[PDB]
Ligand binder design. Structure first.
Ligand SMILES: CCCCCCCCCCCCCCCCCC(=O)OC[C@H](COP(=O)(O)OC[C@H](N)C(=O)O)OC(=O)CCCCCCCCCCCCCCCCC
Ligand SMILES: *[C@@H]1O[C@H](CO)[C@@H](O[C@@H]2O[C@H](CO)[C@@H](O[C@H]3O[C@H](CO)[C@@H](O)[C@H](O)[C@@H]3O)[C@H](O)[C@H]2NC(C)=O)[C@H](O)[C@H]1NC(C)=O
Ligand SMILES: *[C@@H]1O[C@H](CO)[C@@H](O)[C@H](O)[C@H]1NC(C)=O
Ligand code: ALF
Lengths: 320, 805
């Protein structure tokens, strides 16, 4: 009477693996023999990256940029002398670093309007209320609404190779620093014929802006809501100490020859009200990215606390 | 004490039995109050309301819908059970009874009988109340009765009518020969009735148990009798031996409550630590409102003490996933779908009765694998001569570590021979008899108990107890505290190889089970029987088993599981119960572990934001972590996994001892899972924290953000928790392969689909290409692969170490 099928009688065919210490023992060697060459390789790769950090906060009174902590004229300029001991050869990437800056705060992260930055007409003049310490100014919607936009980093950094003592500038390109997908799809301009100023008509600039979003850059393909500097800043960071791509020093003789250097900064961004610091990072990359020994040290140590366990257990099981 | 007039002529309740618990009008208020008085259900409702009112990371629909589901499912199950009991109440009631009111044969319903009226029971017709036999129309004044519903035996007991009224037939018992029956108050003991009848013309005859015809007894071989209703329903001896059904909870169900309380304390500690650290951190003026995220005037005006409570509530909702509401939904589905394996089993099929196993409750499947004591009926259960494999089943149960006691309403001479035939009493087994021959009333039982415990057994022994002596031991156990009758007798019972209880009553059989249930430690008790005499002990034990035999289906309807044969209990416990317990015990542990692994990285993230309650993962990930990513593989495991093959489980009964005492849900196993989840959650967060200590993880120098960080953590977590279950799997069916690999492949496909299109129905596009950009870096791949292996290394080392020596 009860249907005699395999499923109803709990007799479906099954693999039923056995995994004991005669078939699981020999993977503590197979893993220790792959993880150690991998850790060693990705540890040598990281060591070969040339990198340098310059802190230009100017908090200590023996700094060229100490004059900009509380200046009289707001566009002050200071230059920090630094030396490149060994040359940078391949492509060089310039970053700016901020510490004690909580871009991951819950209140900060949601202070945007993704439909507005996607070029939606109904959202340009009606920004969301999640971006509302900075939603409307002067009875008028803010075109890049939100705290993330308002707090956009706005220092200008210039590199000069000394030599003679005649500074020669270094060509920095601002294109190609943001995600292709979020520059070409996620961030779009509002619709309008040819002029960007008349697309942002009933909107106003952010309160901390000194120039509207349609004057961010002269290139029409990098002008507003698609400025790569704006887009890079809009990508909020995970940790309160982070880096953001500033420029690209393209490979050409090394890209950055060893010698004396100048870092002319237009000190605009106040970070010292909170206990924050500002940095400039010059770095080369590899297939694995920037310089970080954690992955190599971890792979080496994981493939070394596996081979030793295998050795100490194969011997212990050979007593029989 | 009680005075009864025969025809209610000058010289109490009605017999409406109530076995149900809910009325139609009061079912919802009574069920929702008993359901929400449970800590888990109350907590779920509180969380649902907090998400609705104060704050929520995800929708408060994934929190309140499963609660609604489980509440309606339980309500429907209990309401259907109560309706089933109501249906039996209305067939016992509303039954035709003939009452002689005024010199005529009136026809009423069974529930309309009053104390002190003449009933007219005919041949092969059950008595409707506790009648006192006034007259059998024979000239002998003797009738024959089979009390198969009170003692389970089908012999013909003989009762005697009152001598001065043996001559009153022909509806003429109203001949102005009225009497006053002065009886005692109702008592549950079937073999003790005291009272007198005062027939007026006054002759005063002393009544006894030979005149009392009890309800539930069939009149046999006598055409017609007349009797007076002395006790009516809920005071009849049958109703006083009924007791009632209590809410049955399995050991897994009670362990789930302890696990939930521990995690409730963990959740409260997490929320309190986060709130305290948040308001310590905000004490610095530039930690809150550092000019780059400033508060509105409303947030600044919000009252200080109100905002602390709101922040605590928000941390509660943010960390609330560690008590999974999906676990209860999965448990209900698994329990409902696992009973079909008992129903479908061809080893429980009987050709004679053309029936198999019957499942009445699906909530006691795991209790079949935790049985410690078996209480058995003898007639119809153990015997037909003996049943098919009665001795082999008992040998298998003893080899499994269980104690088998025989509780029967039969006499000792025949009950003891059956125990000797079932190999329950061996040839070299010395019997300690506490029956009515060895006991000589008085306080000789005191001497007997001390002689058997203090100087005989505390240094082969089978105990034999009678119903009358058990009555003394139990009713006289609330007088002394220096040496308790009950404790002394229970020690002797525990030190005996087998215990025989003979000449018992239906309530005396549940009283024995209650004694064992209240020992030091909690033994799980099983009761098996075929008749209504065994209904009370079936309703009392942890698991009640009915038998579909020749005595009706009263025991098969009040039980949890019904099997045609007693030999069918070997497979029902050794294979089905073992598999059922092992599946659900693994499900509960895995559900807690996989949700602690899910939330610990998010709790560690608050130390790196400003304790701002910012979630580490996307809302679409938080929502479908327990719905789509990690829902099906564990459900398939809890329905198909055979850690030991079924054929092996039935062959070797000593494998039943490995899971005895809730072994898989004890402190050790629980701590193992809890600390493994904590270690894995710490590895998840900190391995990617140290990974994110570089300028860029890509060859093109571009940097990642707070959503890529969380996506990396989520990918590592999902793969680790799936591969842990894959490592724990021992029975790989095609369904197991399908669910385990399809969950992993569906995670990667939903990540590539959900992210990759700008959704017009979303107000945010935070995850547009986060997953696709994360997979474009070899460093991220290497980090994920390393973290999954580090997270499973303690597990691999365990399977390496405990599989040798
Ligand atoms: C007499 C009646 C007998 C009993 C009936 C048994 C038969 C069952 C019938 C079907 C009933 C359906 C159940 C309805 C319940 C809805 C629950 C639901 O979706 O809400 C979501 C719930 C709970 O979420 P959570 O993750 O714990 O987090 C909640 C937390 N409070 C929060 O804030 O968030 O999440 C859950 O409780 C979901 C877990 C259920 C798992 C099973 C369904 C899986 C869906 C299918 C898989 C998805 C496909 C992807 C995989 C494909 C690859 C193989
Ligand atoms: C570079 O970014 C700086 C930080 O966003 C920004 O400083 C901010 O400048 C705005 C505009 O002047 C100030 O806003 C208010 O300033 C005065 C009070 O000092 C008011 O009277 C004005 O009406 C205006 O609303 C912010 O106070 C100021 N914030 C800080 C922390 O200094 C610089 O202006 C930016 N420099 C550029 C764009 O060249
Ligand atoms: C850069 O700063 C130096 C100060 O050492 C100054 O001499 C030079 O004129 C500056 N150049 C520019 C372009 O501002
Ligand atoms: F043998 Al019985 F009650 F004792 F069915």
């Amino acid at each position: 009477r009860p249907d005699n099928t395999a499923f109803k009688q709990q007799r479906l065919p099954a693999w039923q693996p056995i995994l004991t210490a005669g078939t699981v023992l020999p993977i503590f060697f197979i893993i220790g023999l792959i993880f150690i060459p991998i850790g060693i390789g990705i540890f040598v790769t990281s060591n070969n990256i040339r990198e340098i950090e310059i802190d230009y906060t100017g908090t200590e009174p023996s700094s060229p940029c100490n004059k900009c902590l509380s200046p009289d004229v707001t566009p002050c300029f200071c230059t920090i002398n630094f030396t490149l001991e060994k040359s940078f050869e391949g492509n060089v990437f310039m970053y700016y670093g901020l510490s004690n800056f909580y871009q991951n705060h819950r209140r900060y992260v949601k202070s945007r309007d993704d439909s507005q930055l996607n070029g939606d007409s109904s959202a340009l003049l009606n920004p969301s209320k999640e971006c509302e310490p900075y939603r409307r100014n002067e009875d008028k919607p803010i075109a890049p609404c939100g705290a993330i936009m308002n707090s956009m980093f706005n220092d200008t950094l210039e590199l000069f190779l000394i030599g003679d003592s005649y500074p020669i500038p270094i060509a920095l390109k601002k294109k190609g620093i943001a995600w292709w997908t979020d520059k070409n799809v996620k961030f779009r301009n509002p619709p309008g014929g040819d002029n960007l100023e008349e697309r942002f008509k009933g909107t106003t600039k952010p309160v901390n802006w000194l120039k509207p979003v349609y004057m961010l850059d002269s290139d029409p393909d990098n002008n507003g809501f698609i400025n790569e500097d704006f887009i890079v800043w809009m990508r909020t960071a995970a940790l309160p100490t982070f880096r953001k791509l500033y420029r690209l020093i393209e490979r050409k003789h090394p890209t950055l020859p060893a010698g004396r250097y100048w870092l002319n900064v237009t000190y605009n961004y106040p970070v010292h009200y909170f206990d924050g610091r500002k940095r400039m990072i010059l770095s080369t990359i590899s297939w694995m990215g920037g310089k970080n020994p954690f992955l190599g040290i971890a792979y080496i140590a994981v493939g070394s606390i596996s081979f030793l366990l295998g050795v100490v257990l194969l011997v212990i099981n050979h007593k029989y | 004490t009680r005075t009864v007039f025969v025809g209610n002529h000058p010289v109490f309740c009605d017999n409406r039995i109530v076995s149900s618990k809910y009325t139609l009008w009061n079912f919802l208020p009574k069920n929702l109050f008993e359901q929400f008085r449970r800590i888990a259900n109350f907590y779920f409702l509180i969380i649902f309301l907090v998400e609705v009112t104060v704050d929520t990371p995800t929708s408060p629909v994934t929190s309140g819908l499963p609660l609604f589901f489980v509440i309606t499912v339980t309500a429907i199950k209990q309401g259907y059970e109560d309706w089933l009991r109501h249906r039996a109440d209305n067939e016992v009631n509303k039954s035709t009874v003939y009452i002689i009111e005024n010199a005529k044969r009136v026809r009423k319903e069974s529930e309309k009988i009053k104390v002190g009226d003449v009933v007219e029971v005919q041949a092969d017709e059950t008595f409707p109340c506790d009648l006192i036999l006034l007259s059998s129309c024979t000239t002998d004044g003797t009738c024959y009765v089979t009390t198969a519903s009170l003692d389970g035996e089908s012999n013909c007991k003989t009762h005697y009518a009152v001598r001065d009224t043996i001559a009153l037939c022909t509806a003429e018992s109203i001949d102005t020969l009225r009497a006053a029956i002065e009886c005692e108050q109702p008592q549950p003991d079937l073999y003790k009735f005291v009272g007198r009848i005062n027939i007026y013309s006054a002759v005063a005859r002393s009544l006894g148990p030979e005149n009392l015809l009890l309800k539930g007894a069939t009149l046999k071989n006598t055409e017609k009798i007349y009797g007076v209703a002395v006790y009516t329903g809920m005071e009849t001896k049958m109703a006083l031996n009924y007791q009632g059904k209590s809410q049955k909870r399995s050991a897994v169900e009670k362990s789930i409550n302890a696990f939930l309380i521990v995690y409730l304390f963990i959740l409260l500690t997490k929320a309190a630590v986060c709130t305290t650290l948040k308001y310590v951190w905000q004490s610095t003026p530039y930690n809150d409102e550092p000019w780059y995220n400033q508060k509105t005037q409303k947030e600044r005006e919000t009252l200080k003490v109100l905002k602390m409570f709101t922040d605590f509530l928000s941390f509660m909702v943010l960390f609330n996933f560690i008590i999974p509401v999906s676990m209860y939904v999965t448990v209900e589905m698994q329990k409902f779908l696992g009973s079909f394996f008992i129903s479908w089993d061809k080893d429980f099929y009987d050709e004679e009765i053309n029936e198999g196993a019957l499942v009445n409750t699906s909530d006691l499947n795991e209790e079949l694998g935790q049985v410690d004591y078996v209480f058995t009926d003898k007639t119809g259960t153990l015997t037909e001569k003996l049943q098919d494999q009665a001795a082999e089943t008992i040998e298998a149960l003893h080899a499994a570590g269980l104690k088998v006691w025989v509780l029967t309403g039969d006499k000792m001479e025949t009950a003891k021979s059956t125990c000797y035939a079932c190999r329950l009493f061996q040839t070299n087994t010395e019997l300690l008899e506490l029956t009515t021959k060895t006991i000589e009333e008085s306080e000789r039982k005191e001497d007997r108990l001390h002689e058997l415990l203090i100087e005989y057994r505390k240094k082969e022994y089978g105990l034999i107890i009678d119903g009358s002596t058990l009555s003394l031991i139990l009713n006289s156990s609330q007088d002394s505290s220096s040496n308790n009758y009950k404790s002394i007798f229970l020690q002797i019972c525990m030190k005996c190889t087998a215990v025989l209880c003979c000449r018992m009553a239906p309530l005396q059989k549940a009283q024995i089970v209650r004694m064992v249930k209240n020992l030091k430690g909690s033994p799980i008790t099983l009761s098996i029987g075929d008749g209504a005499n065994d209904v009370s002990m079936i309703l009392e034990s942890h698991v009640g088993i009915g038998i579909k035999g020749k005595e009706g289906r009263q025991a098969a309807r009040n039980s949890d599981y019904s099997v045609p044969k007693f030999k069918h209990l070997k497979k029902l416990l050794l294979a089905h119960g073992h598999l059922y317990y092992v599946r659900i015990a693994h499900l509960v542990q895995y559900f807690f572990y996989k949700n602690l692994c899910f939330i610990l990285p998010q709790f560690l993230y608050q130390f790196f934001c400003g304790f701002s309650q910012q979630p580490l993962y996307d809302a679409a990930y938080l929502t479908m972590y327990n719905i789509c990513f990690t829902s099906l593989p564990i459900l398939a495991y809890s329905l198909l996994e055979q850690h030991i093959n079924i054929d092996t489980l039935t062959s070797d009964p000593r494998l039943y001892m490995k899971i005895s005492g809730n072994a898989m849900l004890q402190l050790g196993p629980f701590l193992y899972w809890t600390f493994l989840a904590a270690f894995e959650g710490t590895v998840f967060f900190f391995g990617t924290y140290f990974l994110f200590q570089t300028a860029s993880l890509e060859e093109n120098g571009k940097v990642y953000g707070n959503w890529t960080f969380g996506t990396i953590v989520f990918t590592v977590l999902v793969f680790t928790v799936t591969l842990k279950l894959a490592l724990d799997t021992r029975f790989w069916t095609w369904i197991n392969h399908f669910v385990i690999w399809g969950s992993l492949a569906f995670y990667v496909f939903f990540s590539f689909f959900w992210g990759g299109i700008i959704w017009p129905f979303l107000k945010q596009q935070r995850m547009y290409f986060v997953f696709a950009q994360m997979l474009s870096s070899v460093s991220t791949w290497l980090a994920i692969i390393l973290l999954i292996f580090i997270s499973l290394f303690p597990e691999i080392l365990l399977i390496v170490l405990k599989n040798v020596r």
